[PDB]
Structure formats: C-alpha cells, structure tokens
Design a binder for this molecule. Structure first.
Ligand SMILES: Nc1ncnc2c1ncn2[C@@H]1O[C@H](COP(=O)(O)OP(=O)(O)OP(=O)(O)O)[C@@H](O)[C@H]1O
Ligand SMILES: Nc1ncnc2c1ncn2[C@@H]1O[C@H](COP(=O)(O)OP(=O)(O)OP(=O)(O)O)[C@@H](O)[C@H]1O
Ligand SMILES: Nc1ncnc2c1ncn2[C@@H]1O[C@H](COP(=O)(O)OP(=O)(O)O)[C@@H](O)[C@H]1O
Ligand SMILES: [Mg+2]
Lengths: 517, 328, 495, 328, 58
C-alpha cells in the first residue's frame, strides 16, 4: 500500500548490502539479548559465566554495528535523494516552473529533505528497536506460558482495528494541520515581501488580527491532533496493562501449582512490563515514520519530472568553434505556442535578416513579441515553421550550446546574491578590463568608482541593493560580456530615463557595429 | 487526460451505479479460478484444512459423546476404534477424507450417527476434491499471457503509399507459436457532434484497415505493418499535422483477435494511439532481413521509425491539390 | 497433558456419562463447535477476495460481545490457577468465540457492503447455533452446577441474550494573544537571553508537568519491588493480590504519564503561538534598510518562524523528562542499595561515568550542529535564489555552473552532517550498550529473585535513556534556535 | 400478443408435434449437467448412496449365503473378514468403493464370487466417479449468466443523424471482463405477404446495423448505441409515427454473439422491441462523462431518453420531401 | 472427452425432404425448409448452399 511502497522507495534509494546489515543485525541483536537473559533465568536454578560474558560482548558489538549501520544508511539515503532531486528538478523545462508554484517546489528542498536527513534516521532506529523488542517480548511471554496465546491472538486484532481507526482519522487530521499551517507561512511571506506598502497603508492592526486568527486556528488544529493522540495512547496502554496482568497471573498460577521455575515466572512478568512500556512507543514511532515517509513519497513523486531534450540531433564536431558569423537569420512559418493546449500566439511569420548591426521590432502589448524573442531558444513549442541561423536549423542543436552562443536581455531584471564579479563572471575566465569596459559602456563604471569595494560590493537578494534602473543596467552589463555577433533585447529600456536611454543607445550601436542587435 | 485504453490494453473506464448484482457464488467461483497462483494454492490448502478440522471436531465430539474417551472399560465398543484425543480424531478425519485409511482407526457399527458422519464426510470430500480439480484445471489450462506476447509499436506514423496518405503502425508476435484466424479492428474514438444536435462522448467508428481483400484477416508471423488508407470516407480524412498533440480529442484503438494455436480459446490484445503518439511523416525502419537461408527479424529497433518528407496538409487538401495539378 | 478437562484418574471419569448434558465438559465443547464451523467455513470465501436495519446497532452489539468475550477469557484463564493439569475447556471456547466474532464482522462488511447480500445465511446459521449452545449451557448451569463464581452465571446469561439480539438483527436484515500578552509582559519585566522572561512567565506549567512525570516514573519504578515480592513469595494467597496491585500501579502510572505529557504539549503549543505573535510584531516594526543591505533575507525570516518554532515546540514537548530523569536515576541507586544490592553495586559507577560522556556528546554534537545549520542556511538561500528566477539560468545557459556551485555547499553541509551522524550513532550506541555492561558487571561481581529483579529494574532505568538519546539532540537544536532568535530580535526598529 | 422473444431473451415458441425423439440417455446426461446446483448435488449424493447400498446388500447377502453370519465356529474363513450385520457390510461397501479400506473388513480368497463382486464394485465405482467428475466439471466450468450481464435498453428510439432517419438502442456490459469478437444481428420479424400470393407468419429479415465497415463487429466496453440507418432497402423504410403501438404487427430482434474472454465458449444475448417499446423522436441521454483521469459511466439513467423534435413521416416521405426541397 | 460431447446435435437439425422453386418479388427463387428440434439455441448459425455438378471449362 502506501507505507509499503514509500518505505520500499526509501530503502531502494540505499543499497541492498545496507538493508541486509540493518535487518539481520537487528534480528541478531534483539534475539540474542532475549536469548541471553532467558539463559540467565536458566542460570538461576562456572564456564556458564564465561559464556554469559561472551554473549554480553556479542550483544554489545552487535549493537555497535547496528548503530553504525543506521547512521551510514541515513547518510547515504539523504545524499542520494538530495542530489538526484536537484539534478532532476533542475532538468525540468520552463513549463514545470511557470506552471507549478515556486513555493511548492521550494518547500521540498527546504523542509522535506531536511525532515529526511535529520529526522528519519532517529525515528527509524526508534521504531525499529521498539517494534522488535515488542515482538521479542511477545514471543517470550507466549513461550513461558503457552496459555497466553489464546489471549494474544485476540489482542493483536483489537490493536489492529483501533489503530487503523486512529490512522484513518489521523490522515484527515494531518491534512487539516497542513491546510491550516500553509496560510501561516504564506502570510509571513506576503508580509515580509510587502512590508513597505503595509506600513504605508498603516493597516497593521488588520493584518496582525489576520495572523492572530491564523495562529489560533492552527493551534486548535494541533490541539485536536493532541487529543486524538491521547485517546489512542490511553487505549493502547490500558491494553498493554491488561496484557501484563494476564501474563503475570497466568505464569503465577502455573508455576506455584505446576512448577516450571521462578526465573521464567520473572521473565514472563518482566517482558509483560516491557510490552506495556514499549507498545505505545512502537505505535507512536510508527505514526511518526508514516508521516516522514509520506514526505519521502512526496519528494519521490516530485522526482517524476519532465525531460529536457538537451541532446541535440547533430554532431558537436560539425559545428565550428566560431560558429555565429555576421549573423544572417531566416525565419519562416514560425508558428509557436507555449503548451499543447494553448493557442498559436505567433503564426505564419517569415523574415530574412542579413547583417546590419541592428533591426527593430515594435508594436502594442499582447502582440506576442517577447514570445518571438523566446523562439530563439526553443522555449516556445514552435510547432510549425522554423528558424535558420546562417547554415543550420535550430531544432537539431543541443540546447546547451543553442542557449550559450546567443545572448538575450530580459525585461524584468533578475540578479544574483553575490559580488559583482560573480554576477558578471560565473566562470572565472574574464579579464577585469573587460568587466570595467562592459560597465562603462552601459554607464556603470562611474557608479562603481563611487562604490567602495569596486566590482566587489554585495548585491543582496536578487538585486535589493539598487534601483530597478540599476538592476536592468547590471543585466545589460552581464549580457554585454559575451562575444556573440548577434543578440536580442526585450524592451530593455522601460526602466531607463531618456538621457541614459539615448546615451546607452549611441554607445551600444557604436561599440556593436559588427554585432546584430 | 483519461486515455480510453492504456498502451497495454487496460480500459480506464469507471462503471458507476450498477443497479442489479449478486447472481450466485459461481461468480466468486470464477474469481477463484482467475487468480494468482500462490493465493489460489493457499485457498486450496485452507479448503482442505478447514474440511479436515470441521469433520475432525465432528469425530472427536461424537466419540466424546459416546462416552468413549473416559471409561476404557473394554466391554464397550467405540463409535470408531482407537481415538483418544482430538489429535486422534483429526488423524482419522485425514485418513478418511483423503481415503488413506490406515486401519488402526476404524469405524464400528455401534454408532449409526458415526456412519452418518462417514457418509457426509465422504460426499463432502468427493465434491470438494472435484471442485478443486475443476478449478486447478480451468486455471492451468489457461495461457492468460498470450495477450501479453502480442506487441504493438509504441508509436504510429502516417506517410505516403501509392500516392495516398496512409496511417501505419507495427504489430508482432513474440512466441514462435502461430495465431489462428488473426483479425484486426482499428476503431477511431472521439467526441462527435451530430449534424442534428446530439453529442456522443466516446463515439466510436470502425476505421477499416487496408488489405488485398478488404477483410480483416492477417497472418502474423513476421511483425508487419497494419495500415489504413485514408480515403474520403475515413474519419481521419480531415486530419492534419500540427493538429495532433497531447491536447487533442482523438484516439485510435487497435484490437487483435485470434485463436491460440494450441488451445481453442480466443485471445485479444488492445492498444491505443492518441494524438501525441501518432508521429507524422515517418516510416518504420524495416527490421526483416535475409540471413543464411532464413529471415532474421531484429526485434530491437522494432518500433524504430525514420522521418520522410511528406506534405503538410489534410488528405482532403491532398486530393484537392492533386486534382488541381491533374486537371491540366 | 493437553487435556480438555482431564486432570487425574478421577478426571479419567471427568468424561464418563450419566447423561451427556450433565457433563459440563460436553456442553462446554459443544459451545466450541459452531464457532469453528463459521471460522473454517468463512475462511476460504474470505481469502478469495482478500487474496441496513440496525447497522450501528449491530456495531454496538458486536462491541459489547467483544467486551464480554475478553472478560470471559480472563475469567477462564484465572479459573485454572488451582488445578495442575491446565484443563483448558474453561477458556479455549472463549477465545474461539472471540476469533469467530471478529471473523464474522470482517466477513460481513467485506461481503455485503462490498460484493452482494443474500449470502448472510451462513452468519444466520452461526448465530442460531451459538445461541442454542449457550442456552443449553445456561439451562444446565441453572440447576446442576454449583455456580460458585456467579460471574460465570452472569456472563453466560449475557452471552445468551446477546446472541439472541444478534440473531434478531440478522433475521431483521434478512427481511430486506493571551499567551503573547504575558510573553511581552515578561520580556518587559526582564529587560527592565529570552529564556529569562520565558521561564519567569511560563515555568510553573513546565515544572508542573515535570512533577507529574517525576511522580509517575517513581510509581512505575516501584514495580521491581512487586517483582521481587512475587518471586520470593512463590519461592516457598498473597501473589494474586500483589499482581493485581501491580496492575493498579501501572494504571495510575500511565494515567499520570498522560497528564504530564498533555500538559507539556499544551505548554509547547501556547509557546509556539506566543513566539509566532512576537515575531510577527517585530516584523511589523522591522526596518527595510536592514533587509536590503546588511543581514537578513525573507527566506530565512520565514525559515525561522517555521523551523525555529517547530524546534522550540518539540523541545518543550521533550524537556520535562529532561528534568524528571535525574530523580529516576537517583532513586534507582537508592532502591538498588536498599534491595538485593545492599552492597557492591559497582556496575552503577559506569552509569555515573555515563553522564559526562553524554554531556561531551552534547557539546561535540553542538560543534557539529553550528556548522551544519550555517551551511544549511547557505544551501537554502542558494536554492531559493536559484529557483526564484530560473528563466535566466535557462536562457543564459548557466545551469551547470549554478548546479555545481550549489553542489559545493551541499557537499560541505553533507560533511558536517556526516560528523553529526557519527556523533549521534556514538550516542545511540553508548546509550543502548551501557545497560548490558551494567548488568554483566553487577552479576559477575557476585562471584534467585535478586539478579532478575535487577535485570527488570535496569531495563526500566534504561528506558528513559532511550529517549534522552534524542532529548539531547532536540536540546542542542533549540539552543541554536534561541540563539538565532536573540540575534533576530535585536535589529533596527523604524519609529 | 405472443411476443416472439421476451425482453430477457426467452423464445415464446410452441414446438408441437415433434415426431422423432428418444436418441439416448446422454440427452438426460446433459439435462443433468445443465441443472440447479442443489438438485445436482442431491443427484450426486443419491448416486453414491444408491451405489453403496446396492453393493452393500450384495456383500451382506453373499456373506449370509456363505453361512458366515450364524456359526462363528472359527475353523471356517469368511468371504470377507469381520462383517456381522448389514451395517458391517455397508461400512465395508463404503470402505471399498471410496477406496478407504481400513482393514478390519478384508476380502479373503475363500469366495470367488466375493472377488467377482469386488471387481464389479471397483469398476462401477471408477466409472461413476468419472461420470460425477465430468458432470461437475462441465457444470462449474460454465458461466451461464454471462448472457445475463449483457443488458439492452428497455426501449428503442428513432431519430435523425446525418440528415437520415436512424433506428437506435443502447447496449452495455456490466462485468469488467471483455467480450471477444462481439457481433450484432438486428432482424425484423413480421407477417409478410409475397407479391405472388404466399404469406410467411414469422418472416424474418436481417436489418443490417450501421458501422464504419458495414460489418457486424463491435467493441463493447462502454455502453454504446447500436443503430441502423433506414435506407430505402431497409424494411422499416415504410415505417411512420402513429403506426407503432402495442397492436401493430412488427418486431425487432437484437442478437449479441461473442466469445467470453476467459472461457472459449460463445455467449449469446437476445432482446426484442415491438411497436410499443420503440419510442419516436428521442435520443438517449449520454451517460458517459470524463472524470478524474477516467470515464465515469453512469449506468443509472441507462436507457433514459429525451424527446427531440423530428419529422412525423416515413423515411420514404423524408426522401421525397427532401428531393422536393433540393430540386431547386 | 466422450461424455462432454453432444454428437447428436447434428441430428436434431433437420431439413425438408424436398426443395421447391417458386416466384418471389417477381424473381425465381430456390427454397427449402430448415428447423431445430431442441429448445436450445444455436450460436452463430451459418449457411452454405453449394451446387455440385460435372462442369466443362470453355
Ligand atoms: N444501473 C443498472 N445496473 C444494472 N442493470 C441495469 C441498470 N440499468 C438498466 N439495467 C438493465 O437493463 C435493462 C433495461 O433497463 P431499463 O431501461 O428498464 O432501466 P430503467 O427502467 O431506465 O432504470 P433506470 O431508470 O434506473 O436506468 C433492465 O432489465 C436492467 O436489468
Ligand atoms: N414432426 C416431426 N418431428 C420431428 N422430425 C420431423 C418431423 N417432420 C419431419 N421431420 C424430419 O424432417 C426430415 C424431412 O422431413 P419430411 O419432409 O420427410 O417429413 P415428412 O416425411 O413429410 O413427414 P410429415 O408428413 O409429418 O411432414 C425427416 O427426415 C424427419 O426426420
Ligand atoms: N508563460 C506563458 N504561458 C501562457 N501564455 C503566455 C505566457 N507568456 C506569454 N503568454 C501569452 O503571450 C501573449 C504575449 O506574449 P509576449 O510576447 O510574452 O508578451 P508581449 O506580446 O507583451 O511581448 C499574451 O497574450 C500571453 O497570454
Ligand atoms: Mg512579452
């Protein structure tokens, strides 16, 4: 079912030699601890002492190998999950991100893998030892009194039914916990992100009341969770107590009227006590591992991603190194659409473009022109027609080079958290003279000279360190460091004042006389 | 998107609100005979065990009621000789119903009810044995995977043949056995709207395949190409490139029906092709080749296709432009 | 051996017949038959799928039946304490009936709710037969049997009437805020580092639940006393009273544990509410030049209200044991020196040496955790920004560069996490392996109820250790968490 | 009014005066294998009981005739050891024919006739057991209700489709199993009179159904609409509203024939529609709908129809008036 | 295999001892009668009429 498949995917993300070590070490350790104190009860009514000590040593070394097994398997599972999740989600096409909310895909890298890598090993070892100690004590209390079987076979079914009822309630209850907790963090985000407009509007009290209501609601939800947990735990513990009473009195009656030993009497009552103590821990740890493995299944489902098609039907040796020449572009019938269910936003378009250092596209909004820009990088489906860049079609190149050898400037400025060098030079292969050049030609060096670091000051949080103007300027700058003979701008003047606009335009057209804009 | 048929032939249909049901326990009989081997085996074993224990409780209880377990006086004669525990009565039940009957545990005339129980257990044993035999026979006489050795191509193409536009796909048999009376039904499924107003959600139209006779008989030895000539009568006569895509209301169901060579049962395989799996302007790479006195069939690159330049308009527009070119 | 009701040669007449129904054993077993009938007639017709009037009334009757079945099992097991032959006719029918009723309900809601009705004739016949047999037992139990334990008579008539009600049902269906205010007040009273105000306004409930926990584990710890008494009384009618007293002790024990844990979780929830409120208020007063220039990012700001608050919630769940456990261990030493370890419990010195080893595990794990959490925040901001604007990374074709850049931080974080896991495995093993060392030492140091009561008590004492293993982890986590809070609550405040 | 076929598929026909009969007792054999489960079980039990008693009377009578019941001298050896009542001989017969044979009741060489009876009873037991096994197998290997899980609409309609008048009805399968080689035969039945004089009481004419190929193959997964296009060739080409009513000599038989998926047997369902069940100017409410990645088929409102405005004249008059409107 | 056979179901399907030829729809038509005696149904009933003679090729 759900736990079977989830835990199976979890363990399959680890090796099989690890599951062997884990399972068999657990069986051996617990069964041998049981065997040693059983044989101790036999030691009640000498080389026996020597072999008792050697069994104790066996127990301790088995527990050691158990602990190392658990730690290392948690490590490996977490590493593999995170690495594969990253490398796969990063492979997704633009549709995945433009369609799935970024918060949803972010919550996985944020909490879910965190939940795994520092909560699953602990709960795992907890319920492992819990359930196996419980089952061992059960087997022994069954053995030391053969009568207890006809009381245990009922008890397992009572347990089963009521814990199933609790879990079928708890699934819905946890769904409600999540649907109450999401609005909290959503409100915190929508508060940090728009604090300026709020303090401007002065409607602080209203939003404080909104969060107070959200908090009260989530607390009530957690209270319901707690009440249900108390209900089930009280139930199961009274069960364990009745079991203790049964096993104890039975062993008593038996021994003092049909003797077996006193040691085994003790064993019976003690493992009864142990069941009573560890049954609820088994169940609670089972609930916790079910929650965490639900998170694991969530990540595994997110791992079911869309391909990228980065493999281009061409020969990387056939494309020359300095491939883009003066930059003729013949587009024709370039019918494009975002997804299959969408309309062909741009259709039946042809245009032959010789070089000439510039061309121009204009028109009202909604004309599907930023889409025409995207067509150069196969982001749009381009289901009919095609573009030809001075020798070859586009649908045969590997997307990597296809998007590395052609520049672009987007409308909304998107920057990175880091120093200027990193924003301009992802790779560390660019002489700083070229950096100062790409800044001066975009009218930035005059700003940088007044900046203490000097292509060194930090840009914070996607760009929250300057003006939208300055952000767009940095975007143009990092788009200029490329030696492309062609590139495209998508309304990269909306944030530019007319004076900087004209100056930038003249400078870029003088500096790029051979390049096609 | 609610595929009507899965690629393997599973019908993804929801049959809600079925009023009448519960005919008789022969339905669950068939449920039994059509089931997984380990669980069917388990059902048989528990059938025998439950029979044995039921009649064993019976024998034990009767012997107990005859006042035979306690006295051991000697002058009395038991319902059944030499049973002195439920274990004994259980071994007796096995010896009887399995018809082993060693002899140390024998029925004696002293108890008519014991003879009655003997009669009843013999009848029950015979009937239950016959049921088990019929089940296991009806179950192991089945292939039930002969529908899984009949494969289709993961994609379908449309190309030119004799100047006409034709829909094509590949089909092949994996077992070396022959299929008997192989028959093909291609059937387009879509939501059509009547020229008079009504709408039919999963309307189906039998698109005829192409063949020398026009029938439906094929002879599947080497994996061949099932193809339909797109005439003006074909529902796909108004189909075009750039119209087929995952979000297009269109499906093509292919149904292979044929008698298994050995058993006189008739297997069926289903597959489906919707508007994203139907490639355009491609032809299947021939996998058949001549070998040293044989025909090697490379089942690798089975559904492998190759692009071939083809017109990019409807068979309707094909015929229009062809008449426009041939009218002079 | 394994006799149904045979004890002696005197019970070699416990099956003779001066009238079968006069033989209690015979009616007793005839009660068993219909149960096995239903059981082994409904197994296969259930495995085939597994491989309404008074519906809720049926549920309620079924629950009453399960109840009295369990009670009868208990009575029957008790009624075999005086005889030395385990004549199990007392309780085998009870357990069989129990399993049969369970199977009955299962089969019902697996056939008619799912497949089809008008097959329930089997359940019908079962109810008829069981009712008949129990009526027979009751009738012959009216005059013949002495009926000394009248509870027997009562449960018999109860089952009779209850089978009757079931058969009725069957034929019938066959016919068809405040906390944050105090928190801010405490913060003001302390200021004119948060732990001060936190405790000063909130600690009465903590120490209250911890008091419940201390009283609880003391009472529970008073169970090997019961064990030692059991065994040295059985050595040579007092053991029954004492086992019942053990049962009562366990009941009080766990009903106090539930109270302590519920109070503690209530406290944790109230605290989470108050701290979320205070954080949101500070945000409302927060500056923007700070969020822009110096330190903080919206990402980690929401990250704290999520994870910080979760960590504090769980820590204040798990802390009352962190206070109650020392009482448990010291009473452990006391009670060992008082019972059966009146001298020479040298094994406890290992437990004495344990605590500093555990504290060192704590501080070394904290050294690991600081780096783990800083690299976690690093990777977290990395992936945040990497997914905020992805169209850039796609277009400019820098996927590989940023992927590997994130991988570097992930690898550093993974190294820290590897150290963390090494340390926690050290802790787990030390924790699970000191008790076996202790029992080995205390037992071999001697060179029948003594060593075994030690065994049981040391299991009871190793129980809280098994939770402390993760208590210390949550402790370090909440330490770093409150450090982050004290860091955050000291930023600018736009007047 | 003497419906030719009942709605469930029962033929209300009286076959009087059949001269030749009485072929052999294999007819009653099939009568046995095709019968109700409790009575078939009863027949098997009485078969075994009658066998046991017959041979039991035999053994008892022979032992009696050997002068073995009375003397108990000791120097003599019985035909069969240790039988001292017909009860003993009966238990012996059970032990033998059921092949239990405990051992306290053993045949001894002293009586050749006893050996003869042993041989005879063994043969009879083997043959009767084989007969019972064949019967129970042929009986439980049958579905026999697969013809009852194939439903039709309680009514039929006639409407417009592609401008032509078409007869329609709904058919659906209730089991999730597939039907193999589903085939439909619609057949009009009436009392026709030859243009040369003769009359045919229950004359039948196969009215062809409409399909993409024109064949008879359908693929029944979702309950679909069997419809006939009323061409000039159709016998219903002269049918009109206000002519159909309970007192109108006209019937339409629908026959579904298809191999059961599991067993290689071929089931058939029959239904009939006479001139009162044939609604006019209505179309079946579509019960198929898209659900969360599926097709929900609401089998409630299965045969539910809805009125649609349609002409009120014959397909003959349809074509006449349509040509009258299209001639200009 | 022996008792599972009907083997006389081919003997309960009768034909007329004679055949006629008459007029129907103005055309000359060959006719004969066929009937089933058992009350059971026949499945997928199919007819093949086939003339047999000694022909001579042109
Ligand atoms: N939902 C269903 N489940 C099972 N069988 C059905 C269902 N609907 C119809 N049938 C079968 O089809 C036959 C004809 O159906 P009919 O048209 O009379 O149904 P109906 O009168 O329309 O009932 P409803 O209005 O509930 O669909 C019936 O004899 C019935 O056995
Ligand atoms: N009433 C009947 N019952 C059973 N079989 C019949 C009957 N009438 C004819 N048959 C079968 O049909 C076959 C051909 O029929 P035929 O025309 O010879 O009948 P017939 O000799 O004219 O008898 P009748 O005068 O009763 O019709 C015969 O071989 C006969 O077995
Ligand atoms: N990610 C998207 N998903 C769906 N539709 C889009 C998307 N981006 C743009 N469009 C559609 O494309 C049209 C304009 O495209 P675009 O060229 O990007 O804007 P503009 O024409 O203003 O430059 C809009 O009508 C919008 O509906
Ligand atoms: Mg745009």
């Amino acid at each position: 079912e759900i736990p079977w498949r989830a835990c199976a995917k979890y363990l399959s993300s680890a090796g099989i030699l690890l599951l062997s070590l884990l399972v068999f070490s657990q069986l051996l350790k617990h069964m041998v601890l049981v065997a040693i104190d059983y044989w101790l009860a036999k030691w009640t009514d000498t080389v026996y002492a020597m072999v008792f000590t050697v069994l104790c040593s066996l127990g301790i070394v088995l527990c050691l190998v158990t602990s190392v097994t658990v730690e290392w398997t948690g490590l490996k599972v977490a590493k593999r999950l995170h690495r594969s999740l990253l490398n796969r989600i990063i492979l997704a096409p633009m549709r995945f991100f433009e369609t799935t909310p970024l918060g949803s895909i972010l919550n996985r890298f944020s909490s879910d893998c965190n939940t795994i890598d520092q909560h699953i090993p602990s709960t795992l070892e907890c319920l492992s030892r819990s359930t196996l100690l419980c089952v061992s004590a059960l087997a022994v209390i069954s053995y030391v009194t053969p009568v207890f079987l006809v009381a245990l076979l009922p008890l397992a079914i009572v347990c089963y039914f009521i814990q199933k009822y609790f879990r079928v309630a708890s699934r819905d209850l946890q769904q409600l916990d999540d649907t109450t907790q999401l609005p909290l963090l959503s409100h915190f985000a929508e508060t940090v992100e728009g604090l300026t407009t709020i303090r401007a509007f002065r409607y602080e009290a209203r939003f404080q009341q909104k969060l107070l209501e959200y908090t009260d609601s989530n607390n009530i939800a957690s209270l319901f969770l707690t009440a249900a947990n108390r209900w089930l735990e009280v139930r199961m513990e009274y069960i364990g107590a009745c079991v203790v009473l049964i096993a104890a009195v039975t062993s008593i009656s038996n021994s003092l009227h049909r003797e077996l030993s006193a040691g085994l009497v003790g064993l019976g009552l003690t493992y009864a006590l142990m069941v009573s103590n560890y049954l609820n821990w088994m169940v609670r740890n089972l609930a916790d591992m079910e929650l965490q493995l639900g998170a694991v299944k969530r990540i595994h489902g997110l791992l079911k991603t869309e391909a990228e098609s980065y493999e281009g039907l061409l020969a990387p040796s056939l494309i020359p190194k300095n491939w883009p020449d003066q930059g003729k572009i013949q587009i024709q019938n370039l019918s494009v659409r975002y997804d299959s269910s969408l309309k062909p936003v741009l259709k039946h378009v042809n245009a032959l473009i010789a070089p000439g250092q510039k061309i121009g596209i204009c028109g009202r909004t909604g004309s599907g022109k930023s889409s025409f820009s995207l067509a150069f990088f196969r982001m749009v489906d381009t289901f009919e027609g095609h573009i030809i860049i001075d020798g070859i079609d586009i649908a045969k190149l590997p997307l990597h080079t296809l998007r590395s050898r052609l520049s672009i400037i987007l409308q909304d400025p998107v920057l990175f958290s880091g120093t200027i060098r990193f924003n301009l030079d992802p790779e560390r292969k660019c002489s700083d003279s070229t950096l100062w050049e790409a800044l001066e030609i975009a009218q930035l060096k005059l700003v940088v000279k007044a900046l203490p670091g000097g292509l060194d000051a930090i840009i914070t949080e996607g760009g929250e360190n300057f003006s939208q103007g300055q952000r767009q300027l940095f975007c143009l700058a990092r788009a200029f460091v490329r030696k492309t003979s062609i590139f495209i701008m998508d309304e990269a003047t909306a944030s530019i004042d007319m004076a900087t606009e004209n100056i930038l335009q003249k400078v870029v057209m003088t500096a790029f006389a051979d390049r096609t804009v | 998107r609610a595929r009507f048929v899965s690629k393997k032939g599973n019908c993804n249909v929801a049959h809600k609100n079925i009023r009448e049901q519960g005919r008789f326990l022969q339905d669950v009989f068939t449920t039994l005979v059509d089931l997984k081997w380990p669980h069917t085996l388990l059902i048989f074993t528990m059938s025998f065990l439950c029979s044995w224990l039921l009649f064993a409780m019976a024998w034990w209880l009767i012997a107990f009621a005859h006042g035979d377990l306690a006295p051991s006086e000697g002058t009395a004669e038991p319902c059944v000789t030499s049973i002195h525990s439920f274990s004994s009565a259980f071994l007796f039940s096995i010896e009887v119903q399995v018809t082993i009957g060693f002899g140390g545990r024998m029925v004696t005339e002293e108890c008519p009810l014991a003879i009655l129980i003997l009669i009843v257990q013999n009848i029950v044993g015979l009937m239950i044995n016959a049921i088990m035999l019929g089940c296991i026979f009806m179950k192991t006489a089945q292939a039930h995977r002969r529908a899984e050795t009949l494969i289709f191509s993961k994609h379908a193409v449309i190309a030119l043949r004799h100047g006409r536009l034709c829909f094509m796909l590949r089909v092949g048999d994996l077992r070396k056995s022959m299929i008997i009376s192989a028959t093909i039904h291609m059937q387009v499924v879509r939501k059509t709207t009547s020229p008079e107003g009504e709408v039919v959600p999963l309307h189906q139209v039998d698109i005829p395949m192409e063949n020398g006779v026009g029938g439906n008989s094929i002879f599947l030895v080497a994996p061949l190409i099932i193809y339909h000539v797109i005439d003006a009568n074909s529902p796909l006569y108004d189909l075009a490139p750039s119209d087929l895509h995952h979000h297009q209301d269109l499906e093509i169901i292919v149904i292979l029906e044929g008698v298994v060579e050995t058993t006189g049962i008739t297997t069926q395989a289903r597959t489906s092709y919707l508007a994203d799996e139907i490639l355009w302007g491609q032809r299947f790479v021939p996998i058949v080749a001549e070998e040293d006195g044989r025909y090697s069939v490379d089942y690798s690159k089975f559904g492998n296709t190759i692009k071939v330049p083809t017109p990019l308009c409807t068979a309707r527009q094909l015929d229009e432009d062809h008449s426009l070119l041939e009218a002079l | 051996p394994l006799a149904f009701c045979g004890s002696e040669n005197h019970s070699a007449a416990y099956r003779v017949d001066q009238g079968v129904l006069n033989n209690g054993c015979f009616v007793d077993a005839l009660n068993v038959v219909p149960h096995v009938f239903l059981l082994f007639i409904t197994f296969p017709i259930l495995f085939i799928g597994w491989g309404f009037p008074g519906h809720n009334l049926r549920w309620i009757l079924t629950f009453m039946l399960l109840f009295v079945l369990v009670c009868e099992i208990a009575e029957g097991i008790l009624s075999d304490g005086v005889t030395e032959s385990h004549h199990l006719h007392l309780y085998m029918p009870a357990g069989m009936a129990f399993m049969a009723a369970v199977t009955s309900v299962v089969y019902y809601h697996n056939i008619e709710t799912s497949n089809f009705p008008k097959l329930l004739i089997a359940l019908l016949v079962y109810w008829t037969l069981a009712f008949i047999t129990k009526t027979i037992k009751f009738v012959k139990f009216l005059d013949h049997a002495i009926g000394f334990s009248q509870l027997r008579f009562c449960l018999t008539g109860l089952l009779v009437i209850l089978y009757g009600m079931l058969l009725l049902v069957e034929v019938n269906v066959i016919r068809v805020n405040y906390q944050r205010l105090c928190e801010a007040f405490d913060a003001q009273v302390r200021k004119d580092a948060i732990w001060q105000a936190l405790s000063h306004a909130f600690g009465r409930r903590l120490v209250l639940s911890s008091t419940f926990r201390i009283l609880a584990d003391l009472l529970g710890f008073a169970g090997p006393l019961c064990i030692f008494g059991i065994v040295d009384h059985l050595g040579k009618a007092n053991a029954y009273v004492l086992a019942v007293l053990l049962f009562l002790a366990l009941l009080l024990q766990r009903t106090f544990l539930q109270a302590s844990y519920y109070v503690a979780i209530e406290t944790g929830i109230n605290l989470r509410g108050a701290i979320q409120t205070k954080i949101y208020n500070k945000i409302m007063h927060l500056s923007t030049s700070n969020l822009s220039m110096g330190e903080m990012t919206a990402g980690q700001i929401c990250n704290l209200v999520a994870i910080d608050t979760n960590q504090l919630m769980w820590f204040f769940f798990l802390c009352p044991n962190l206070w109650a456990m020392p009482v448990q261990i010291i009473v452990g030493v006391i009670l060992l020196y008082y019972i059966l370890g009146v001298s020479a419990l040298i094994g406890a010195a290992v437990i004495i040496l344990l605590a500093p080893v555990q504290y060192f595990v704590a501080t070394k794990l904290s050294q690991a955790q600081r780096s783990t959490l800083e690299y976690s925040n690093e990777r977290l901001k990395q992936t945040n920004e990497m997914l905020r604007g992805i169209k850039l990374l796609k277009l400019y074709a820098w996927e590989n560069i940023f992927r590997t850049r994130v991988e570097t931080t992930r690898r550093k974080e993974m190294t820290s996490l590897r150290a963390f896991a090494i340390y926690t495995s050290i802790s787990i093993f030390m924790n699970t392996a000191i008790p076996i060392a202790a029992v080995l030492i205390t037992f071999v140091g001697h060179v029948p109820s003594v060593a075994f009561a030690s065994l049981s008590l040391f299991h009871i004492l190793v129980t809280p250790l098994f939770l402390l293993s993760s208590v210390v982890r949550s402790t370090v986590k909440a330490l770093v968490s409150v450090q982050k809070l004290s860091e955050f609550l000291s930023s600018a405040e736009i007047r």
